[PDB]
Ligand binder design. Structure first.
Ligand code: SAH
Lengths: 8, 249
């Protein structure tokens, strides 16, 4: 919903 | 004269004699990559690379390193990216990376190009670097997914990106980490790395043994259960593969 980049 | 070795958690290191101020400054300082063989030897100031030449750490005697310069004219220097500049020399490849990976058509159907290993290596081996421009999480999270195909979070305040047209090897090949495709059963992970040329970035490190010509994959780690909306925040191709996986086995 907010984060739109790799790595969890 | 005494010699100091400063190892980073990533395996890389700085070595050389320090001046009065106890700083890594001189014309004989070197950064040694994680293989403890490939190195950039030359001028550094307080540990920062001014002019490093590709060299090989031949041996070490009582902590004193012996380097042999590689044939060639290529020179490297600290060149940390900004929000708009990705590199001063986009077409100058990284020497360590160049000996370990190559780009070719991915084995994953319709996944474009992929990153492949040139050699058989064991677990926890650094294979590639993920350099790119540095932008904020707000900027990235506030734009369409179409522009976030290569974004990778560096930390809480910075996101690394390889925007068009730098996503083309013909335009940028200084680093190749952005060429590794996604897999829910990856053989690599993104890990922190302090690079003499790129500065603080992330690298691709193997999780286990990898064979020569094996495709390197990493779990992109997109939010599957994002708080505030019942919908995995990720591109369509990802959601599709996710469902196929959760159903696969
Ligand atoms: N498992 C997968 N299935 C389908 N496409 C994938 C994938 N992993 C990565 N991709 C594709 O990879 C782009 C990731 S950047 C990785 C490099 C890219 N394939 C290239 O040719 O430049 C994504 O936007 C998506 O198009």
């Amino acid at each position: 919903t907010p984060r739109r980049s790799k790595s969890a | 004269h005494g010699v100091c070795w400063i190892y980073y958690p990533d395996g890389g290191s700085l070595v050389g004699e320090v001046n009065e101020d106890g700083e890594m400054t001189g014309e004989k300082i070197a950064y040694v990559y994680p293989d403890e063989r490939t190195a950039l030897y030359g001028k550094f100031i307080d540990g920062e690379m001014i002019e490093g030449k590709l060299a090989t750490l031949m041996s070490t005697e009582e902590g004193r390193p012996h380097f042999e310069l590689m044939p060639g004219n290529s020179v490297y220097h600290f060149d940390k990216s900004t929000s708009s500049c990705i590199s001063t020399n986009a077409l100058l490849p990284d020497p360590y990376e160049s000996e370990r990976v190559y780009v070719a058509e991915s084995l994953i159907s319709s996944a474009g190009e992929g990153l492949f290993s040139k050699v058989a290596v064991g677990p926890n081996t650094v294979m590639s670097f993920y350099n790119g421009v540095r932008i904020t999480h707000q900027e990235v999270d506030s734009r369409d997914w179409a522009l976030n195909g290569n974004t990778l979070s560096l930390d809480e305040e910075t996101v690394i990106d390889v925007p068009e047209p730098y996503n083309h090897v013909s335009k940028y090949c200084a680093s190749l980490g952005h060429k590794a495709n996604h897999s829910f059963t990856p053989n690599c992970i993104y890990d922190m790395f302090v690079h003499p040329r790129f500065g603080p970035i992330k690298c691709i490190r193997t999780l286990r043994a990898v064979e020569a010509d094996e495709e390197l994959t990493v779990a992109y780690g997109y939010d599957h259960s994002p708080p505030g909306k019942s919908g995995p925040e990720a591109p369509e191709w990802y959601q599709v593969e996710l469902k196929a996986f959760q159903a696969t086995q």
